[PDB]
Structure 1
């Protein structure tokens, strides 16, 4: 169970239009992952959160998903 930041290159944390990368920080559900899972900084995570929320309002990322299997 590696960390999200671990596998990735240089990427803008303020860029809400980039779904490809932002989707990696979400849950099985729509949830924004804990820092333990994102391996991010305090500041970093604080920025990512607002950027993701922007993308949600913007229609790009989900607010919620449905749990499969179960």
Structure 2
């Protein structure tokens, strides 16, 4: 039932608040810009809840996509 690794264990000592580390945040977005479900970012209620606002900030500095297109359909 939808399984793989959690984006969490693929990273190390990382700031969940830096709206500027595009290089990392991107990982928490799907093929579409859509923000990944907890059951995949493997985060905790509070963690996830922070990563949300931290993303949407970057999404405004145009460092992260609001939305993307689905290749191979």
Pair in the same fold by TM > 0.5: yes
Q: What is the RMSD of the two structures over their aligned residues, measured on CA atoms?
A: 0.4
- Give structure 1 stretches of 5+ with no counterpart: none
TM-score of the two chains, using structure 1 as the length reference: 0.98
* TM-score, length basis structure 2: 0.94
Aligned partner of 1:55 in structure 2 is 58
Give the C-alpha shift of residue 17 in structure 1. 0.3
Aligned length: 70
Structure holding more helix per residue: 1
Q: Which runs of 4+ in 1 moved over 2 A?
A: none
